[PDB]
Amino acid sequence: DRPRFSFSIAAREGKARTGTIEMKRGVIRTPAFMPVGTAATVKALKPETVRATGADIILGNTYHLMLRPGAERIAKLGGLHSFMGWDRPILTDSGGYQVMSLSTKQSEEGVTFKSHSRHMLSPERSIEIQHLLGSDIVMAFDECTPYPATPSRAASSMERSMRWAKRSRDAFDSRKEQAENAALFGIQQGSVFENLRQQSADALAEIGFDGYAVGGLAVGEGQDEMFRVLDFSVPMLPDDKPHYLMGVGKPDDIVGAVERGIDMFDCVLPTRSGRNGQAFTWDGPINIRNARFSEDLKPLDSECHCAVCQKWSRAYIHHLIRAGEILGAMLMTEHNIAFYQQLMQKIRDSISEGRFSQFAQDFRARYFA
Amino acid sequence: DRPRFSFSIAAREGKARTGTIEMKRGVIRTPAFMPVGTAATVKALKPETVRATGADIILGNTYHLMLRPGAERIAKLGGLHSFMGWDRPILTDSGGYQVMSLSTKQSEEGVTFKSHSRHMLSPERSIEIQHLLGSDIVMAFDECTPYPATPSRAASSMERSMRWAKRSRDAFDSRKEQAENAALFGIQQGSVFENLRQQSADALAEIGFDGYAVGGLAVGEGQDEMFRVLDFSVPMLPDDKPHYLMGVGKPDDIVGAVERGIDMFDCVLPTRSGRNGQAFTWDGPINIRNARFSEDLKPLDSECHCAVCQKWSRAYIHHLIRAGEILGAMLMTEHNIAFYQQLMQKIRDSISEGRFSQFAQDFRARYFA
Ligand SMILES: [Cl-]
Ligand SMILES: [Cl-]
Ligand SMILES: [Zn+2]
Ligand SMILES: [Zn+2]
């Protein structure tokens, strides 16, 4: 039987790595893209369809689930895996970003907030909620510093996050069933400042985690600045553990982040923008609602292997999205998630074959033509 | 290869019949339930899922399709079957009911109307639209008399419908490809009046059709009155052709209509009410949004063989519908359509085995317990 957690790097090219995370509930191929399952569903997809696109792991949102249907309720019903019908690994966010984005009174103990009923979220309660959900990869409870941030405020926020990271570690370790069956990732903060990123990486490595997220990015800084911060931030993390870039991103963001040593990604872009009419293609995104697609018999993308591109035309999906039909959301979302997984597969294969630099160049030349 | 049209009755019990309609695109088992595909989609279901529930044929709506995406456009794209990805028979309504329900100036030539742009619908144009869509079963263009109707107005409406039935017949026959590959059904009118129903049946039989619909029912008269009208109306139609009750209905309506000689049904109830939270069960309908289901781990129905009842709980579907999640609509709709098909299968098997009367009694005793 598989271990609780084992990350193995099979091949490297520059800072890029490809390999596997083995966990009780399954193997995760890296670099990995995690479809987002906000309220115990990857929107508009059955779990079997999520798996058919190639996903090895999905992300669940602690903040939404603790409000509806409730963490204790999900536990009483058998846990999130049974509840939604996904039997493979689930990574849960901690709620720290979402509570400040969607709900508040912050203190050293945690955050109290009103639902959008009053609720509480501390490091200890976040880890407990993730236990009740039955998460496989638990995220430490942190604070995502707003951008831009002054050096003083970025430092204060990062320092509190590091104290909360130790509290998260101890809460996780004090629950035997969780410690033996799940993994715990810590989150690097520090805004765009190299010295704070270094202090944060050092604090997290001293505590010790199964994986390390780069937090606090994709919050308005733009790709050039995000890449500049990744350039110095990823090498600060332990090389032998997974590196997770939270909330990223567009296809070109993913490619460049892999070039900088990132192993894991999540984003609502393929699901949310799919429902809004944006389809990803190797020649760049298209908006299927545009009148130019009304009689276009071609599939969404000319090479995509997904079931949507095997059967239905742009013209049909254009009609469905314009009409507000649920099937339009279903088909756009399946295609976009499949596109993301095909991107990850091409990334993994090209690193394994020592041709990822050429892949990145070819990808960009065509995607932005 | 299959014929254009052949209806064969394999078994009978009282007025009930079971058999098959063979058409170019497939075999239809009768009594049959047709899921409704309004705007070129059975809402929230891929065609493969519609087929997996047991459907042999679906209904398409001329009125909606002629407005969006347009009949000529669908023809240019290869027809409705190719467009939506359903390769089996499709019956299309004529637009006569929907134009008066959703859009008007009526005359002997047809109906002119404004979309909800001005448009026209005559017997000739309706048959042409259904040809452009590539319909397998074409409905004559008629007028669904409102209920209640005075005898004079019901007579005038029925008489016009019979003139339009002859125009529909001639338009269909004058298009060689349509006449050779599709079938044409006529629609009996006459409101609740036996003498008008008889005159209408006689006029339709003189013209001659491949099947005969009972129109003008399920328009507010209630089940007792609907059944009373069916009691005398169905025997007036040719015994050796299918009998189609348009727009019906609830499970108990279907059972009683089969007892009165009906072979075909369509209704938005399983799809529309599924999206609204109503699930059909052998113990009657339930509203999954009710708080009593929040922790209910049982499937929607305890015997149902559908994929939804094999995997997901009432509690999960309750959560999805309360949250407004697309997957909730998908799962409710698949279950409800599968329930309807299982009902039709039990009806067919019980007639074939000479035990339909007992089935109807057992069904009602439990469904209304
Ligand atoms: Cl989403
Ligand atoms: Cl519907
Ligand atoms: Zn595709
Ligand atoms: Zn079911």
Side-chain angles (χ1 to χ4, degrees), chain A residues 2-61 63-75 77-97 99-102 104 106-113 115 117 119-175 178-205 207-249 251-309 311-369, chain B residues 2-61 63-75 77-97 99-102 104 106-113 115 117 119-175 178-205 207-249 251-309 311-369:
Chain A
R2 285 181 293 271
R4 177 192 71 86
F5 187 87
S6 177
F7 176 54
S8 182
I9 297 170
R12 317 189 65 148
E13 181 174 340
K15 294 182 172 180
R17 309 104 68 79
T18 189
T20 52
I21 304 167
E22 292 200 1
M23 305 194 67
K24 296 295 184 184
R25 290 185 164 103
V27 179
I28 302 153
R29 296 167 290 175
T30 69
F33 182 77
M34 299 182 282
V36 174
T38 304
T41 166
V42 179
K43 293 185 190 296
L45 298 182
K46 287 178 176 177
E48 64 198 71
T49 309
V50 179
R51 176 56 184 172
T53 71
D56 294 327
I57 172 169
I58 63 171
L59 181 145
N61 289 134
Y63 171 81
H64 296 271
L65 292 177
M66 72 180 286
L67 297 175
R68 195 169 59 179
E72 277 79 5
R73 173 166 289 166
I74 285 170
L77 297 176
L80 180 57
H81 290 87
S82 178
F83 185 63
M84 72 182 290
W86 174 267
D87 69 11
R88 277 173 190 274
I90 297 176
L91 182 149
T92 48
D93 59 30
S94 64
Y97 174 86
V99 70
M100 298 306 303
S101 181
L102 306 176
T104 58
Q106 294 165 286
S107 75
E108 185 67 20
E109 179 67 15
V111 189
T112 68
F113 64 102
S115 169
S117 59
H119 299 269
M120 177 275 300
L121 256 189
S122 61
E124 294 76 21
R125 175 61 177 162
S126 173
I127 300 303
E128 184 194 20
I129 289 166
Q130 297 179 72
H131 168 68
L132 291 166
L133 296 174
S135 171
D136 303 282
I137 304 177
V138 175
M139 298 305 302
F141 186 73
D142 68 332
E143 183 175 288
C144 180
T145 309
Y147 178 87
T150 67
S152 166
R153 293 185 59 86
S156 296
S157 179
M158 178 275 293
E159 291 158 4
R160 174 167 285 173
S161 289
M162 301 302 92
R163 296 188 296 267
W164 288 0
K166 171 62 171 160
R167 282 166 64 186
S168 296
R169 176 85 262 179
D170 292 346
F172 180 96
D173 291 337
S174 295
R175 187 172 286 109
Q178 187 171 38
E180 288 169 21
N181 295 286
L184 182 68
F185 282 22
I187 306 170
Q188 186 200 43
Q189 295 290 346
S191 180
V192 305
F193 306 109
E194 182 171 20
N195 69 322
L196 301 186
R197 288 281 169 183
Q198 183 68 70
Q199 295 170 16
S200 184
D202 292 341
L204 296 175
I207 296 164
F209 291 91
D210 296 309
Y212 298 84
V214 178
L217 297 180
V219 288
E221 75 279 2
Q223 191 196 75
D224 292 350
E225 183 75 346
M226 185 174 74
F227 282 179
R228 186 185 69 85
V229 176
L230 289 175
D231 286 336
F232 58 69
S233 295
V234 187
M236 302 172 174
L237 308 175
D239 183 76
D240 71 343
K241 295 301 177 56
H243 306 152
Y244 167 29
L245 182 56
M246 302 180 76
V248 173
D252 45 306
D253 295 332
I254 291 174
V255 171
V258 170
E259 291 179 291
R260 292 164 174 82
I262 297 299
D263 308 302
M264 299 170 65
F265 298 92
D266 75 276
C267 196
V268 302
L269 191 63
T271 42
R272 184 175 295 177
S273 84
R275 300 193 307 278
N276 191 240
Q278 178 171 68
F280 292 92
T281 87
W282 296 110
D283 302 288
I286 62 175
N287 194 316
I288 203 62
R289 299 185 58 110
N290 192 286
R292 73 172 68 94
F293 300 116
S294 68
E295 299 184 354
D296 189 341
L297 286 169
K298 297 190 297 299
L300 290 171
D301 176 89
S302 66
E303 298 173 16
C304 179
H305 299 93
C306 90
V308 182
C309 292
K311 187 164 179 194
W312 296 280
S313 63
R314 285 164 172 197
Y316 181 60
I317 299 168
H318 165 92
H319 158 72
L320 292 175
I321 293 287
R322 282 237 181 170
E325 282 287 344
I326 290 168
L327 184 62
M330 292 164 56
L331 297 182
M332 288 289 294
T333 298
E334 176 172 359
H335 165 78
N336 279 349
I337 292 290
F339 181 90
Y340 266 63
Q341 294 301 332
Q342 286 166 94
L343 173 65
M344 304 317 295
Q345 188 63 58
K346 288 172 182 289
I347 290 171
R348 293 192 293 263
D349 290 340
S350 71
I351 300 163
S352 298
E353 295 178 8
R355 56 179 181 79
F356 174 56
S357 180
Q358 191 63 52
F359 169 74
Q361 175 176 333
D362 297 340
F363 165 79
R364 287 188 275 260
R366 179 176 174 188
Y367 194 82
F368 297 112
Chain B
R2 285 181 293 271
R4 177 192 71 86
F5 187 87
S6 177
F7 176 54
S8 182
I9 297 170
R12 317 189 65 148
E13 181 174 340
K15 294 182 172 180
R17 309 104 68 79
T18 189
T20 52
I21 304 167
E22 292 200 1
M23 305 194 67
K24 296 295 184 184
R25 290 185 164 103
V27 179
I28 302 153
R29 296 167 290 175
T30 69
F33 182 77
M34 299 182 282
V36 174
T38 304
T41 166
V42 179
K43 293 185 190 296
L45 298 182
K46 287 178 176 177
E48 64 198 71
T49 309
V50 179
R51 176 56 184 172
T53 71
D56 294 327
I57 172 169
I58 63 171
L59 181 145
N61 289 134
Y63 171 81
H64 296 271
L65 292 177
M66 72 180 286
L67 297 175
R68 195 169 59 179
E72 277 79 5
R73 173 166 289 166
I74 285 170
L77 297 176
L80 180 57
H81 290 87
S82 178
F83 185 63
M84 72 182 290
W86 174 267
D87 69 11
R88 277 173 190 274
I90 297 176
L91 182 149
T92 48
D93 59 30
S94 64
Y97 174 86
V99 70
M100 298 306 303
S101 181
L102 306 176
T104 58
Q106 294 165 286
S107 75
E108 185 67 20
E109 179 67 15
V111 189
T112 68
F113 64 102
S115 169
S117 59
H119 299 269
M120 177 275 300
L121 256 189
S122 61
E124 294 76 21
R125 175 61 177 162
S126 173
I127 300 303
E128 184 194 20
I129 289 166
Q130 297 179 72
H131 168 68
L132 291 166
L133 296 174
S135 171
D136 303 282
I137 304 177
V138 175
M139 298 305 302
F141 186 73
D142 68 332
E143 183 175 288
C144 180
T145 309
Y147 178 87
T150 67
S152 166
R153 293 185 59 86
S156 296
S157 179
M158 178 275 293
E159 291 158 4
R160 174 167 285 173
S161 289
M162 301 302 92
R163 296 188 296 267
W164 288 0
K166 171 62 171 160
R167 282 166 64 186
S168 296
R169 176 85 262 179
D170 292 346
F172 180 96
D173 291 337
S174 295
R175 187 172 286 109
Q178 187 171 38
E180 288 169 21
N181 295 286
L184 182 68
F185 282 22
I187 306 170
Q188 186 200 43
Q189 295 290 346
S191 180
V192 305
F193 306 109
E194 182 171 20
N195 69 322
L196 301 186
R197 288 281 169 183
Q198 183 68 70
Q199 295 170 16
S200 184
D202 292 341
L204 296 175
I207 296 164
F209 291 91
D210 296 309
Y212 298 84
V214 178
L217 297 180
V219 288
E221 75 279 2
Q223 191 196 75
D224 292 350
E225 183 75 346
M226 185 174 74
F227 282 179
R228 186 185 69 85
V229 176
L230 289 175
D231 286 336
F232 58 69
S233 295
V234 187
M236 302 172 174
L237 308 175
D239 183 76
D240 71 343
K241 295 301 177 56
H243 306 152
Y244 167 29
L245 182 56
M246 302 180 76
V248 173
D252 45 306
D253 295 332
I254 291 174
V255 171
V258 170
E259 291 179 291
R260 292 164 174 82
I262 297 299
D263 308 302
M264 299 170 65
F265 298 92
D266 75 276
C267 196
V268 302
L269 191 63
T271 42
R272 184 175 295 177
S273 84
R275 300 193 307 278
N276 191 240
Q278 178 171 68
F280 292 92
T281 87
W282 296 110
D283 302 288
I286 62 175
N287 194 316
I288 203 62
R289 299 185 58 110
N290 192 286
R292 73 172 68 94
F293 300 116
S294 68
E295 299 184 354
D296 189 341
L297 286 169
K298 297 190 297 299
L300 290 171
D301 176 89
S302 66
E303 298 173 16
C304 179
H305 299 93
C306 90
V308 182
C309 292
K311 187 164 179 194
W312 296 280
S313 63
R314 285 164 172 197
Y316 181 60
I317 299 168
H318 165 92
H319 158 72
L320 292 175
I321 293 287
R322 282 237 181 170
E325 282 287 344
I326 290 168
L327 184 62
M330 292 164 56
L331 297 182
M332 288 289 294
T333 298
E334 176 172 359
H335 165 78
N336 279 349
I337 292 290
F339 181 90
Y340 266 63
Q341 294 301 332
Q342 286 166 94
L343 173 65
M344 304 317 295
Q345 188 63 58
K346 288 172 182 289
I347 290 171
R348 293 192 293 263
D349 290 340
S350 71
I351 300 163
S352 298
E353 295 178 8
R355 56 179 181 79
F356 174 56
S357 180
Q358 191 63 52
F359 169 74
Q361 175 176 333
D362 297 340
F363 165 79
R364 287 188 275 260
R366 179 176 174 188
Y367 194 82
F368 297 112

PDB file of all heavy atoms in Angstrom, chain B residues 154-171:
ATOM      1  N   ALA B 154     -64.582  26.040 -29.866  1.00  0.00           N
ATOM      2  CA  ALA B 154     -63.886  24.769 -30.037  1.00  0.00           C
ATOM      3  C   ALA B 154     -64.110  24.212 -31.435  1.00  0.00           C
ATOM      4  O   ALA B 154     -63.186  23.673 -32.057  1.00  0.00           O
ATOM      5  CB  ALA B 154     -64.356  23.776 -28.975  1.00  0.00           C
ATOM      6  N   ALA B 155     -65.331  24.347 -31.958  1.00  0.00           N
ATOM      7  CA  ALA B 155     -65.614  23.864 -33.303  1.00  0.00           C
ATOM      8  C   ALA B 155     -64.835  24.657 -34.347  1.00  0.00           C
ATOM      9  O   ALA B 155     -64.219  24.081 -35.246  1.00  0.00           O
ATOM     10  CB  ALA B 155     -67.121  23.918 -33.574  1.00  0.00           C
ATOM     11  N   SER B 156     -64.877  25.990 -34.260  1.00  0.00           N
ATOM     12  CA  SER B 156     -64.155  26.814 -35.227  1.00  0.00           C
ATOM     13  C   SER B 156     -62.669  26.499 -35.217  1.00  0.00           C
ATOM     14  O   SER B 156     -62.027  26.421 -36.274  1.00  0.00           O
ATOM     15  CB  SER B 156     -64.362  28.296 -34.903  1.00  0.00           C
ATOM     16  OG  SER B 156     -65.717  28.684 -35.039  1.00  0.00           O
ATOM     17  N   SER B 157     -62.104  26.339 -34.025  1.00  0.00           N
ATOM     18  CA  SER B 157     -60.684  26.058 -33.897  1.00  0.00           C
ATOM     19  C   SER B 157     -60.348  24.690 -34.472  1.00  0.00           C
ATOM     20  O   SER B 157     -59.367  24.534 -35.211  1.00  0.00           O
ATOM     21  CB  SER B 157     -60.314  26.120 -32.419  1.00  0.00           C
ATOM     22  OG  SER B 157     -58.952  25.835 -32.236  1.00  0.00           O
ATOM     23  N   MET B 158     -61.156  23.684 -34.138  1.00  0.00           N
ATOM     24  CA  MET B 158     -60.923  22.347 -34.665  1.00  0.00           C
ATOM     25  C   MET B 158     -61.040  22.327 -36.185  1.00  0.00           C
ATOM     26  O   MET B 158     -60.227  21.688 -36.867  1.00  0.00           O
ATOM     27  CB  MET B 158     -61.899  21.366 -34.012  1.00  0.00           C
ATOM     28  CG  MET B 158     -61.782  19.928 -34.512  1.00  0.00           C
ATOM     29  SD  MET B 158     -62.720  19.591 -36.018  1.00  0.00           S
ATOM     30  CE  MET B 158     -64.414  19.761 -35.418  1.00  0.00           C
ATOM     31  N   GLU B 159     -62.043  23.022 -36.735  1.00  0.00           N
ATOM     32  CA  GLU B 159     -62.240  23.030 -38.183  1.00  0.00           C
ATOM     33  C   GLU B 159     -61.045  23.649 -38.891  1.00  0.00           C
ATOM     34  O   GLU B 159     -60.569  23.117 -39.903  1.00  0.00           O
ATOM     35  CB  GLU B 159     -63.545  23.754 -38.545  1.00  0.00           C
ATOM     36  CG  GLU B 159     -64.785  22.986 -38.115  1.00  0.00           C
ATOM     37  CD  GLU B 159     -66.018  23.863 -37.957  1.00  0.00           C
ATOM     38  OE1 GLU B 159     -65.958  25.077 -38.259  1.00  0.00           O
ATOM     39  OE2 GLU B 159     -67.055  23.325 -37.514  1.00  0.00           O
ATOM     40  N   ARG B 160     -60.538  24.767 -38.364  1.00  0.00           N
ATOM     41  CA  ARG B 160     -59.336  25.352 -38.937  1.00  0.00           C
ATOM     42  C   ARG B 160     -58.161  24.383 -38.828  1.00  0.00           C
ATOM     43  O   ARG B 160     -57.387  24.221 -39.780  1.00  0.00           O
ATOM     44  CB  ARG B 160     -59.020  26.687 -38.254  1.00  0.00           C
ATOM     45  CG  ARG B 160     -57.709  27.293 -38.700  1.00  0.00           C
ATOM     46  CD  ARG B 160     -57.580  28.730 -38.243  1.00  0.00           C
ATOM     47  NE  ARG B 160     -58.417  29.588 -39.064  1.00  0.00           N
ATOM     48  CZ  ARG B 160     -58.627  30.877 -38.837  1.00  0.00           C
ATOM     49  NH1 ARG B 160     -58.059  31.473 -37.796  1.00  0.00           N
ATOM     50  NH2 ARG B 160     -59.415  31.565 -39.653  1.00  0.00           N
ATOM     51  N   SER B 161     -58.001  23.729 -37.667  1.00  0.00           N
ATOM     52  CA  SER B 161     -56.916  22.760 -37.521  1.00  0.00           C
ATOM     53  C   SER B 161     -57.015  21.641 -38.551  1.00  0.00           C
ATOM     54  O   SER B 161     -55.990  21.155 -39.042  1.00  0.00           O
ATOM     55  CB  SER B 161     -56.883  22.184 -36.102  1.00  0.00           C
ATOM     56  OG  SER B 161     -56.435  23.157 -35.174  1.00  0.00           O
ATOM     57  N   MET B 162     -58.233  21.211 -38.893  1.00  0.00           N
ATOM     58  CA  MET B 162     -58.355  20.148 -39.884  1.00  0.00           C
ATOM     59  C   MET B 162     -57.998  20.637 -41.284  1.00  0.00           C
ATOM     60  O   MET B 162     -57.390  19.899 -42.066  1.00  0.00           O
ATOM     61  CB  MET B 162     -59.735  19.487 -39.824  1.00  0.00           C
ATOM     62  CG  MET B 162     -60.078  18.866 -38.465  1.00  0.00           C
ATOM     63  SD  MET B 162     -58.910  17.611 -37.888  1.00  0.00           S
ATOM     64  CE  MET B 162     -57.745  18.567 -36.906  1.00  0.00           C
ATOM     65  N   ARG B 163     -58.361  21.879 -41.625  1.00  0.00           N
ATOM     66  CA  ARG B 163     -57.886  22.448 -42.883  1.00  0.00           C
ATOM     67  C   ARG B 163     -56.366  22.553 -42.892  1.00  0.00           C
ATOM     68  O   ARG B 163     -55.717  22.267 -43.907  1.00  0.00           O
ATOM     69  CB  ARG B 163     -58.535  23.813 -43.118  1.00  0.00           C
ATOM     70  CG  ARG B 163     -60.056  23.745 -43.281  1.00  0.00           C
ATOM     71  CD  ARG B 163     -60.658  25.078 -43.706  1.00  0.00           C
ATOM     72  NE  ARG B 163     -60.504  26.144 -42.717  1.00  0.00           N
ATOM     73  CZ  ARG B 163     -61.406  26.445 -41.786  1.00  0.00           C
ATOM     74  NH1 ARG B 163     -62.514  25.731 -41.662  1.00  0.00           N
ATOM     75  NH2 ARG B 163     -61.196  27.463 -40.966  1.00  0.00           N
ATOM     76  N   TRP B 164     -55.781  22.951 -41.761  1.00  0.00           N
ATOM     77  CA  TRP B 164     -54.328  23.028 -41.668  1.00  0.00           C
ATOM     78  C   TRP B 164     -53.678  21.650 -41.697  1.00  0.00           C
ATOM     79  O   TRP B 164     -52.526  21.525 -42.133  1.00  0.00           O
ATOM     80  CB  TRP B 164     -53.926  23.770 -40.398  1.00  0.00           C
ATOM     81  CG  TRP B 164     -54.190  25.251 -40.448  1.00  0.00           C
ATOM     82  CD1 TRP B 164     -54.728  25.974 -41.484  1.00  0.00           C
ATOM     83  CD2 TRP B 164     -53.903  26.186 -39.412  1.00  0.00           C
ATOM     84  NE1 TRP B 164     -54.791  27.303 -41.139  1.00  0.00           N
ATOM     85  CE2 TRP B 164     -54.294  27.461 -39.873  1.00  0.00           C
ATOM     86  CE3 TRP B 164     -53.354  26.070 -38.132  1.00  0.00           C
ATOM     87  CZ2 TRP B 164     -54.148  28.608 -39.096  1.00  0.00           C
ATOM     88  CZ3 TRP B 164     -53.213  27.206 -37.363  1.00  0.00           C
ATOM     89  CH2 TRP B 164     -53.610  28.460 -37.846  1.00  0.00           C
ATOM     90  N   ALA B 165     -54.392  20.619 -41.236  1.00  0.00           N
ATOM     91  CA  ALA B 165     -53.848  19.266 -41.285  1.00  0.00           C
ATOM     92  C   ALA B 165     -53.702  18.797 -42.723  1.00  0.00           C
ATOM     93  O   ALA B 165     -52.709  18.151 -43.075  1.00  0.00           O
ATOM     94  CB  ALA B 165     -54.748  18.317 -40.499  1.00  0.00           C
ATOM     95  N   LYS B 166     -54.683  19.121 -43.576  1.00  0.00           N
ATOM     96  CA  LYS B 166     -54.569  18.782 -44.986  1.00  0.00           C
ATOM     97  C   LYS B 166     -53.441  19.563 -45.644  1.00  0.00           C
ATOM     98  O   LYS B 166     -52.656  18.996 -46.411  1.00  0.00           O
ATOM     99  CB  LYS B 166     -55.903  19.019 -45.690  1.00  0.00           C
ATOM    100  CG  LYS B 166     -55.849  18.902 -47.206  1.00  0.00           C
ATOM    101  CD  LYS B 166     -55.445  17.515 -47.674  1.00  0.00           C
ATOM    102  CE  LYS B 166     -55.617  17.375 -49.185  1.00  0.00           C
ATOM    103  NZ  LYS B 166     -54.811  16.250 -49.744  1.00  0.00           N
ATOM    104  N   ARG B 167     -53.318  20.855 -45.329  1.00  0.00           N
ATOM    105  CA  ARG B 167     -52.202  21.632 -45.862  1.00  0.00           C
ATOM    106  C   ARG B 167     -50.862  21.066 -45.402  1.00  0.00           C
ATOM    107  O   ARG B 167     -49.891  21.060 -46.166  1.00  0.00           O
ATOM    108  CB  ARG B 167     -52.342  23.104 -45.470  1.00  0.00           C
ATOM    109  CG  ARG B 167     -53.363  23.853 -46.323  1.00  0.00           C
ATOM    110  CD  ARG B 167     -53.756  25.194 -45.723  1.00  0.00           C
ATOM    111  NE  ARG B 167     -52.627  26.108 -45.651  1.00  0.00           N
ATOM    112  CZ  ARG B 167     -52.686  27.295 -45.061  1.00  0.00           C
ATOM    113  NH1 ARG B 167     -53.823  27.690 -44.504  1.00  0.00           N
ATOM    114  NH2 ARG B 167     -51.619  28.083 -45.031  1.00  0.00           N
ATOM    115  N   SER B 168     -50.786  20.605 -44.146  1.00  0.00           N
ATOM    116  CA  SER B 168     -49.553  20.003 -43.629  1.00  0.00           C
ATOM    117  C   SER B 168     -49.214  18.720 -44.379  1.00  0.00           C
ATOM    118  O   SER B 168     -48.061  18.502 -44.768  1.00  0.00           O
ATOM    119  CB  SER B 168     -49.702  19.709 -42.132  1.00  0.00           C
ATOM    120  OG  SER B 168     -49.871  20.885 -41.356  1.00  0.00           O
ATOM    121  N   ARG B 169     -50.216  17.857 -44.572  1.00  0.00           N
ATOM    122  CA  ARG B 169     -50.047  16.627 -45.337  1.00  0.00           C
ATOM    123  C   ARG B 169     -49.487  16.914 -46.725  1.00  0.00           C
ATOM    124  O   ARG B 169     -48.537  16.257 -47.175  1.00  0.00           O
ATOM    125  CB  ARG B 169     -51.410  15.937 -45.442  1.00  0.00           C
ATOM    126  CG  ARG B 169     -51.468  14.680 -46.297  1.00  0.00           C
ATOM    127  CD  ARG B 169     -51.047  13.465 -45.493  1.00  0.00           C
ATOM    128  NE  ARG B 169     -49.655  13.131 -45.742  1.00  0.00           N
ATOM    129  CZ  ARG B 169     -49.004  12.127 -45.156  1.00  0.00           C
ATOM    130  NH1 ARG B 169     -49.601  11.386 -44.230  1.00  0.00           N
ATOM    131  NH2 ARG B 169     -47.747  11.878 -45.494  1.00  0.00           N
ATOM    132  N   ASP B 170     -50.088  17.884 -47.430  1.00  0.00           N
ATOM    133  CA  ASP B 170     -49.676  18.159 -48.804  1.00  0.00           C
ATOM    134  C   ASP B 170     -48.281  18.771 -48.855  1.00  0.00           C
ATOM    135  O   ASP B 170     -47.495  18.463 -49.758  1.00  0.00           O
ATOM    136  CB  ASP B 170     -50.701  19.063 -49.502  1.00  0.00           C
ATOM    137  CG  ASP B 170     -52.034  18.374 -49.728  1.00  0.00           C
ATOM    138  OD1 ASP B 170     -52.109  17.131 -49.604  1.00  0.00           O
ATOM    139  OD2 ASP B 170     -53.011  19.080 -50.046  1.00  0.00           O
ATOM    140  N   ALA B 171     -47.957  19.650 -47.902  1.00  0.00           N
ATOM    141  CA  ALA B 171     -46.612  20.218 -47.858  1.00  0.00           C
ATOM    142  C   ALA B 171     -45.569  19.135 -47.624  1.00  0.00           C
ATOM    143  O   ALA B 171     -44.518  19.115 -48.275  1.00  0.00           O
ATOM    144  CB  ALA B 171     -46.526  21.267 -46.754  1.00  0.00           C
TER     145      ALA B 171
END
